[PDB]
Write an enzyme that holds these catalytic residues in place. Structure first.
Site, PDB file in Angstrom:
ATOM      1  CB  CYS A  84      -8.542  63.425  15.485  1.00  9.20           C
ATOM      2  SG  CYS A  84      -8.098  61.631  15.413  1.00  9.20           S
ATOM      3  NE  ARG A 144     -11.354  64.268  18.472  1.00  7.61           N
ATOM      4  CZ  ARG A 144     -12.149  65.288  18.780  1.00  7.61           C
ATOM      5  NH1 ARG A 144     -12.049  65.872  19.965  1.00  7.61           N
ATOM      6  NH2 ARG A 144     -13.045  65.720  17.904  1.00  7.61           N
ATOM      7  CD1 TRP A 149      -7.204  52.577  11.979  1.00  6.23           C
ATOM      8  CD2 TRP A 149      -6.032  52.008  13.809  1.00  6.23           C
ATOM      9  NE1 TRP A 149      -8.086  52.470  13.027  1.00  6.23           N
ATOM     10  CE2 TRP A 149      -7.398  52.121  14.158  1.00  6.23           C
ATOM     11  CE3 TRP A 149      -5.107  51.648  14.797  1.00  6.23           C
ATOM     12  CZ2 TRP A 149      -7.858  51.883  15.462  1.00  6.23           C
ATOM     13  CZ3 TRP A 149      -5.559  51.417  16.085  1.00  6.23           C
ATOM     14  CH2 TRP A 149      -6.920  51.532  16.409  1.00  6.23           C
ATOM     15  CD  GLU A 154      -6.501  59.442   7.049  1.00  8.19           C
ATOM     16  OE1 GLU A 154      -5.626  60.324   7.182  1.00  8.19           O
ATOM     17  OE2 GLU A 154      -6.651  58.477   7.855  1.00  8.19           O
TER      18      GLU A 154
HETATM   19  C1  HEM Z   1      -5.967  55.309  15.370  1.00  3.58           C
HETATM   20  C2  HEM Z   1      -6.617  55.599  14.240  1.00  3.58           C
HETATM   21  C3  HEM Z   1      -6.802  57.047  13.725  1.00  3.58           C
HETATM   22  C4  HEM Z   1      -7.627  57.381  12.718  1.00  3.58           C
HETATM   23  C5  HEM Z   1      -8.540  56.425  11.900  1.00  3.58           C
HETATM   24  C6  HEM Z   1      -7.524  58.815  12.530  1.00  3.58           C
HETATM   25  C7  HEM Z   1      -8.196  59.557  11.594  1.00  3.58           C
HETATM   26  C8  HEM Z   1      -7.943  60.872  11.273  1.00  3.58           C
HETATM   27  C9  HEM Z   1      -8.341  61.536  10.048  1.00  3.58           C
HETATM   28  C10 HEM Z   1      -9.118  60.859   8.883  1.00  3.58           C
HETATM   29  C11 HEM Z   1      -7.935  62.816  10.123  1.00  3.58           C
HETATM   30  C12 HEM Z   1      -8.163  63.881   9.023  1.00  3.58           C
HETATM   31  C13 HEM Z   1      -6.829  64.194   8.351  1.00  3.58           C
HETATM   32  C14 HEM Z   1      -6.957  64.448   6.872  1.00  3.58           C
HETATM   33  O1  HEM Z   1      -8.009  64.101   6.287  1.00  3.58           O
HETATM   34  O2  HEM Z   1      -5.992  64.983   6.269  1.00  3.58           O
HETATM   35  C15 HEM Z   1      -7.250  63.011  11.406  1.00  3.58           C
HETATM   36  C16 HEM Z   1      -6.674  64.179  11.906  1.00  3.58           C
HETATM   37  C17 HEM Z   1      -5.910  64.336  13.050  1.00  3.58           C
HETATM   38  N1  HEM Z   1      -5.469  63.319  13.913  1.00  3.58           N
HETATM   39 FE1  HEM Z   1      -6.371  61.347  13.950  1.00  3.58          FE
HETATM   40  N2  HEM Z   1      -6.622  59.326  13.446  1.00  3.58           N
HETATM   41  C18 HEM Z   1      -6.138  58.271  14.206  1.00  3.58           C
HETATM   42  C19 HEM Z   1      -5.181  58.398  15.204  1.00  3.58           C
HETATM   43  C20 HEM Z   1      -4.578  59.546  15.697  1.00  3.58           C
HETATM   44  C21 HEM Z   1      -3.530  59.624  16.718  1.00  3.58           C
HETATM   45  C22 HEM Z   1      -2.865  58.412  17.418  1.00  3.58           C
HETATM   46  C23 HEM Z   1      -3.237  60.927  16.924  1.00  3.58           C
HETATM   47  C24 HEM Z   1      -2.210  61.557  17.912  1.00  3.58           C
HETATM   48  C25 HEM Z   1      -1.636  60.918  18.949  1.00  3.58           C
HETATM   49  C26 HEM Z   1      -4.090  61.711  16.038  1.00  3.58           C
HETATM   50  C27 HEM Z   1      -4.123  63.094  15.959  1.00  3.58           C
HETATM   51  C28 HEM Z   1      -4.708  63.839  14.961  1.00  3.58           C
HETATM   52  C29 HEM Z   1      -4.619  65.279  14.823  1.00  3.58           C
HETATM   53  C30 HEM Z   1      -3.884  66.307  15.726  1.00  3.58           C
HETATM   54  C31 HEM Z   1      -5.424  65.602  13.564  1.00  3.58           C
HETATM   55  C32 HEM Z   1      -5.629  67.019  12.983  1.00  3.58           C
HETATM   56  C33 HEM Z   1      -4.473  67.220  12.015  1.00  3.58           C
HETATM   57  C34 HEM Z   1      -4.528  68.600  11.443  1.00  3.58           C
HETATM   58  O3  HEM Z   1      -5.092  69.535  12.098  1.00  3.58           O
HETATM   59  O4  HEM Z   1      -3.978  68.781  10.316  1.00  3.58           O
HETATM   60  N3  HEM Z   1      -4.878  60.838  15.323  1.00  3.58           N
HETATM   61  N4  HEM Z   1      -7.290  61.796  12.070  1.00  3.58           N
HETATM   62  N1  LIG Z   2      -5.204  58.152   9.856  1.00  8.04           N
HETATM   63  C1  LIG Z   2      -4.663  59.276  10.391  1.00  8.04           C
HETATM   64  C2  LIG Z   2      -4.136  59.250  11.686  1.00  8.04           C
HETATM   65  C3  LIG Z   2      -3.593  60.405  12.246  1.00  8.04           C
HETATM   66  C4  LIG Z   2      -3.576  61.565  11.475  1.00  8.04           C
HETATM   67  C5  LIG Z   2      -3.034  62.736  11.996  1.00  8.04           C
HETATM   68  C6  LIG Z   2      -3.018  63.893  11.225  1.00  8.04           C
HETATM   69  C7  LIG Z   2      -3.537  63.892   9.929  1.00  8.04           C
HETATM   70  C8  LIG Z   2      -3.506  65.165   9.092  1.00  8.04           C
HETATM   71  N2  LIG Z   2      -2.800  64.899   7.849  1.00  8.04           N
HETATM   72  C9  LIG Z   2      -1.478  65.188   7.749  1.00  8.04           C
HETATM   73  C10 LIG Z   2      -0.857  66.001   8.708  1.00  8.04           C
HETATM   74  C11 LIG Z   2       0.502  66.310   8.624  1.00  8.04           C
HETATM   75  C12 LIG Z   2       1.250  65.796   7.570  1.00  8.04           C
HETATM   76  C13 LIG Z   2       0.641  64.987   6.607  1.00  8.04           C
HETATM   77  F1  LIG Z   2       1.381  64.503   5.591  1.00  8.04           F
HETATM   78  C14 LIG Z   2      -0.724  64.682   6.689  1.00  8.04           C
HETATM   79  C15 LIG Z   2      -4.076  62.713   9.414  1.00  8.04           C
HETATM   80  C16 LIG Z   2      -4.104  61.556  10.183  1.00  8.04           C
HETATM   81  N3  LIG Z   2      -4.629  60.421   9.664  1.00  8.04           N
END
Ligand code: HEM
Ligand SMILES: Nc1ccc2ccc(CNc3cccc(F)c3)cc2n1
Ligand code: HEM
Ligand SMILES: Nc1ccc2ccc(CNc3cccc(F)c3)cc2n1
Ligand SMILES: C[C@H](O)[C@H](O)[C@H]1CNc2nc(N)[nH]c(=O)c2N1
Ligand SMILES: C[C@H](O)[C@H](O)[C@H]1CNc2nc(N)[nH]c(=O)c2N1
Ligand SMILES: [Zn+2]
Lengths: 407, 411
Positions: free
Chosen positions: B108, B111, B280, B285
Site C-alpha cells: 500500500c 500508508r 480514496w 487505479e
Molecule cells: C486512503 C487512501 C489510500 C490510497 C491512495 C491507497 C492506495 C493503494 C493502491 C494504489 C494500492 C495498489 C492496489 C492495486 O493497484 O490494485 C493499494 C493496496 C493496498 N491497500 Fe491502500 N490505499 C489507501 C487506503 C487504504 C486503507 C484505508 C487500507 C486498509 C485499512 C488499505 C490497505 C491496502 C492493502 C492491504 C493493499 C494490498 C492489497 C493486495 O495485496 O491486493 N489501503 N493501496
Molecule cells: N485506493 C485504494 C485503497 C485501498 C486499496 C486496497 C486494496 C487494493 C487492491 N485492489 C483490490 C483488492 C481486492 C479487490 C479489488 F477489487 C481490488 C486497492 C486499493 N486501492
C-alpha cells in the site's frame, strides 16, 4: 518444488523445473524479500568446471560420451596441474551465449543464441585491447544494422594480472561539475570524466563529448585511447511533429556496450568482457534523458510544449515523457539505426519465456528489471508472474577498478 | 542483524531493524525470489503465542509494557482461550490492530494516512440484513459528500470456520460484467463471474455498461443475501477531459469510493473474514488499470482513434499517449467534482516521506516494490529508485479464497 507462474492477463500458466538447477544465491530469505535491491582454489574449481562441462556436453547430445569423459578427465588434469584451466573455443562461445540467456534482468534475451563471440584471450596490452574494442565496435555497429557481440579478454589468474575496461560502457558522454554548481553533460559520468583528466585526458568540455577508453591490461596502469569518431554512430534527436525539438540540442549514441561486468564460465572469471546489443527506446528517453540524476530535461521539454507545470495533477511530466520517447524511436528508425520499442520488446520477451519454459523448463527473470520504466501495465510483462534465480554461466557485477587497482 | 536500503536518486541510505520482528513467510528462499508472484480452523495450541505477541505489541505502543494492566490482560486472555478456545479483543485493541494491519500492508502506497482510520466495530452483528445496515453506514460516512474519509467495518471473527461472516463482493461498490453470446463483454470484465452469481441469486440486472452490483452478504455461515445499496449513497463521477470535448461522449464514469471487501484481517491470531475497508483512489487505479488494461474496459483503442493517432505501428507510442490523456481526464473529473483523489506523483512522494519517517521511528517500513511503483511512469516517481525490504508483520490483511468456492450451501 515444481513451481508455476501465472500470467494474469491471459490465464496462461507455465511450470518451472529449471530453477532446481540453480547454484547461486538471491539475497532473499523466507523472512525477507530483497527483490528490489540493486546489488545483493583448485577445490572450488573442478566441480564448477564439471557442472559447466556436463551442461555443455548435454547440450550437444553427447552426455556420457568418450569425448565428454575425456574432456572432464583432461580438465581435471589441467586443474590439478596448473591450478586453473582453459576453455575450448566451442565452450567459450557456448558459455557466453548462455551467460546472456541466464541474465534474469535482460528483456532482450530472445536473441541470446545469435551472439558474435570474439576471442581476445591472446591479448597482452592496452593497445591490443584498444584494437580488439575498435574491431568490436565497428562489427557491432555495422553502419546502423546492429549486431550483438562480446569480446572476451584473458581470464583472471591471481587477481593481480587483471584485464579491465574502466569505462562502464565502451561509449558514454562526459559530465563535468561546474563553478556554477550545476552539471554539464552526463552527471552519471562526472567521476569518470574526472579520472580521465586525472590520468591525462583533455576534455573539450562539451555536453555530449564521447569519453575516451581507459584500458587496463594484465593488471597494469590503465591507458587512454580515443575511439575513432567514424566508428561512433550517433543519432541526432528530432520529434516527428514538434520542430522545436531539434533545437533542444540532443543526440545519443547507437551502440549500448556494457563494459564493466564480469563473465563467469565454469568457475573461470573474465573481468574484461565488453558486450553490446541494441537499445530499447526507453533506456535513452526515460532513463538517460528524464532521470533526475541524469540529463533531466523534463522541465525544459514541458515548457516548450507549454504545459500546465503548476500542479503535478496535470500529468505534464507524463505527457512530455511520452513525446520524448516518441522522438528517440523516431530518430533512430528514420536514421536506419537498430532500436526496439518497449511494447515490441516486452511482447518478444513473453514469446521467449514461452519458448524457454517449453524447451528448457523455465526462464529466470527479474520483474523489477523486465518491466519498462514507463507504461508498465500496458505491456504484457507487467501481468506476467516471474521467478528469479541465478544460473551459471553468468554476468556479474564487480567493483569499480579505481577502488581496487593496486597502482 | 542490520539491513540497509539505498535510494539511487538521492543516495539516502536507511537501516532496517524492524524486519527482525517478522514472523510470517515471504515465499522466497536463498535460491529463488518469488517477489512477482501475486499470491504466494486454528487451535489453542498456536493461539496463545499469537495473542501474547499481539498484546505485548499493544501494551508497548501505549507505554504500559509489563504493567499490571498488561499482565492481567494476558492472564484474562489466557483463561478465555483455554476455556473457550478463542478470545475477544477490547475496543482499544481492535482499533489498534486494524490500524496496524494497514500500517503493515507492504503493498500500500497510501500508508502515510494509516493512523487516521475510522474503525467501525460491527462485532455485535448477526444477520445479512444487519450487515447491509452497517455497510450502508460505512459507505455514507466514508463518502462524506466527496470529502472521503478512511474507514473499516469489522464483523465478527471466525470461530470454527463454519459460521464465517463474508462479504462476497470483491469491493463494496463495483460495476457489473456481462458475457455476451458473441464473446464480447458488456461492462467490467473483472466482475463477470461475480455478476453471474448475483443474477443466479435473483438479482435483476439492468445489463448496462455501468450497473452498480448489489451487495451479496453472508452472516454466521448462512447462505448469502442480495441487497441494493441506495443509489443516493453511491457517489459517482462522470469522466471528461479538460481539452478534449469528445471525451465526455465516450460515456465513461467511475465510482468515488474504493472499498475493498474481500480481504481477511488477522489480529493476535484472530481472523476477521469480513472487514470491508475504504480510503480514496490514486488516479492510475482507474485511469491505467480499470480503463486501459486489456482484460478490463480496455478503451485505449477508442480513445486513440478519437485522438487520431498513428495506430499502425506500436513504435508510434499511441497506447502510451492515449493512456496519459485518460489519466489526465480521471484526475480532472474527480477534482472538478470535489471528490478526493491523489495523482501517482503526489502519492509516491508522500510515501517516500512516510517510509523515511517509519525507518526513523519504527526501524523500518516493509514495502513491496512491485506493487508500490505505479503502473505508468514508473521511473519518474521517487519510489522507482527506492530500494525496499519486503517482509510480513502482524496484524495484517490477507487474501482468502472466494466464498463461492468454499461455501457449504444450506438451501
Ligand atoms: C486512503 C487512501 C489510500 C490510497 C491512495 C491507497 C492506495 C493503494 C493502491 C494504489 C494500492 C495498489 C492496489 C492495486 O493497484 O490494485 C493499494 C493496496 C493496498 N491497500 Fe491502500 N490505499 C489507501 C487506503 C487504504 C486503507 C484505508 C487500507 C486498509 C485499512 C488499505 C490497505 C491496502 C492493502 C492491504 C493493499 C494490498 C492489497 C493486495 O495485496 O491486493 N489501503 N493501496
Ligand atoms: N485506493 C485504494 C485503497 C485501498 C486499496 C486496497 C486494496 C487494493 C487492491 N485492489 C483490490 C483488492 C481486492 C479487490 C479489488 F477489487 C481490488 C486497492 C486499493 N486501492
Ligand atoms: C540485442 C538487444 C538487447 C536488448 C534490447 C537488451 C535490453 C536490455 C534492457 C532494457 C536491460 C535493462 C537495463 C537497464 O534498464 O538499465 C538489460 C539488461 C541486461 N542485459 Fe540486455 N539487451 C540486449 C542485448 C544484450 C546482450 C548482447 C547481452 C550480453 C551479452 C545482454 C545482457 C544483459 C545483462 C547482463 C543485463 C543486466 C545487467 C545488470 O544486471 O545491470 N543484453 N538489457
Ligand atoms: N540495451 C541494453 C543491452 C545490454 C545491456 C546490458 C546491461 C545493462 C545494464 N545497464 C548498465 C550496466 C552496467 C553499466 C552500465 F553503464 C549500464 C543495460 C543493457 N542495455
Ligand atoms: C505479476 C504481478 O504480481 C502482477 O501483475 C501485479 C504487478 N504489480 C501490481 N501492482 C499493483 N499496484 N496492483 C496490481 O494489481 C499489480 N499486479
Ligand atoms: C530500486 C531499484 O532496484 C532500482 O531503481 C532499479 C529498478 N528497476 C530497474 N530496471 C531497469 N531495467 N534498470 C534499472 O536501472 C532499474 N533500477
Ligand atoms: Zn525475494
Amino acid at each position: 518444488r515444481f513451481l508455476k507462474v501465472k500470467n494474469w492477463e491471459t490465464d496462461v500458466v507455465l511450470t518451472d523445473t529449471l530453477h532446481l538447477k540453480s547454484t547461486l544465491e538471491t539475497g532473499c530469505t523466507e523472512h525477507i524479500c530483497m527483490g528490489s535491491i540493486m546489488l545483493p582454489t583448485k577445490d572450488q574449481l573442478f566441480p564448477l568446471a564439471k557442472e559447466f562441462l556436463d551442461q555443455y556436453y548435454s547440450s550437444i547430445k553427447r552426455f556420457g560420451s568418450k569425448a565428454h569423459m575425456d574432456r572432464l578427465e583432461e580438465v581435471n588434469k589441467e586443474i590439478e596441474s596448473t591450478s586453473t584451466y582453459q576453455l575450448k573455443d566451442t565452450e567459450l562461445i557456448y558459455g557466453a551465449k548462455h551467460a546472456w540467456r541466464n541474465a534474469s534482468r535482460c528483456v532482450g534475451r530472445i536473441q541470446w543464441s545469435k551472439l558474435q563471440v570474439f576471442d581476445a584471450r591472446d591479448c597482452t596490452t592496452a593497445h591490443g585491447m584498444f584494437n580488439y574494442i575498435c574491431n568490436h565496435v565497428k562489427y557491432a555497429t555495422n553502419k546502423g544494422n546492429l549486431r550483438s557481440a562480446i569480446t572476451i579478454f584473458p581470464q583472471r589468474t591471481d587477481g593481480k594480472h587483471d584485464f579491465r575496461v574502466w569505462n562502464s560502457q565502451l561509449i558514454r558522454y562526459a559530465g563535468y561539475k561546474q563553478p556554477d554548481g550545476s552539471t554539464l553533460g552526463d552527471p552519471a559520468n562526472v567521476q569518470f570524466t574526472e579520472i580521465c583528466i586525472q590520468q591525462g585526458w583533455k576534455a573539450p568540455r562539451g555536453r555530449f563529448d564521447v569519453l575516451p577508453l581507459l584500458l587496463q591490461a594484465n593488471g597494469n596502469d590503465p591507458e587512454l585511447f580515443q575511439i575513432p569518431p567514424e566508428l561512433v554512430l550517433e543519432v541526432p534527436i528530432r520529434h516527428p511533429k514538434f520542430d522545436w525539438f531539434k533545437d533542444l540540442g540532443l543526440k545519443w549514441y547507437g551502440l549500448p556496450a556494457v563494459s564493466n561486468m564480469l563473465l563467469e564460465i565454469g568457475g573461470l572469471e573474465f573481468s574484461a568482457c565488453p558486450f553490446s546489443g541494441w537499445y530499447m527506446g526507453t533506456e535513452i528517453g526515460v532513463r538517460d534523458y528524464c532521470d533526475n540524476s541524469r540529463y533531466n530535461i523534463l522541465e525544459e521539454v514541458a515548457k516548450k510544449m507549454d504545459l500546465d507545470m503548476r500542479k503535478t495533477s496535470s500529468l505534464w511530466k507524463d505527457q512530455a515523457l511520452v513525446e520524448i520517447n516518441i522522438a528517440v524511436l523516431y530518430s533512430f528508425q528514420s536514421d536506419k539505426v537498430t532500436i526496439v520499442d518497449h511494447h515490441s520488446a516486452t511482447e518478444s520477451f513473453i514469446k521467449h519465456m514461452e519458448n524457454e519454459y517449453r524447451c528448457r523448463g523455465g526462464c529466470p527473470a527479474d520483474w523489477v528489471w523486465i518491466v519498462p520504466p514507463m507504461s508498465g501495465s500496458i505491456t504484457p510483462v507487467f501481468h506476467q508472474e516471474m521467478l528469479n534465480y541465478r544460473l551459471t554461466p553468468s554476468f556479474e557485477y564487480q567493483p569499480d577498478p579505481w577502488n581496487t587497482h593496486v597502482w
